Amino acid sequence: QFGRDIADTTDAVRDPQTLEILDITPCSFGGVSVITPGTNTSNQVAVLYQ
């Protein structure tokens, strides 16, 4: 019916309406970081996605 992996997480699933199989990959998560100089110097910042 459905697959797993080493980390005990679901990776592949089979729909009932078709004999095909659909893979599962989680939505892209990631931390955010703020590149910045001193606020005495400038007010601008740069956004970095990890």
Binding site: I6, A7, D8, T9
Partner: protein
């Protein structure tokens, strides 16, 4: 003693370098610490999940 034995020292050093180049691949258990630390990191990350 270096200047009366320069060719001998050069030959010994080159033979030792070739020997250690062969011995870094011949012995399989010569990389204990790096493999252990990366395997420990992988296992500690796996046991949390």
């Amino acid at each position: 003693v270096l200047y009366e034995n320069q060719k001998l020292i050069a030959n010994q050093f080159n033979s030792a370098i070739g020997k250690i180049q062969d011995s870094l691949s011949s012995t399989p258990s010569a990389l204990g610490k790096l493999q252990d630390v990366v395997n420990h990191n992988a296992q500690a990350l796996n046991t949390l999940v």
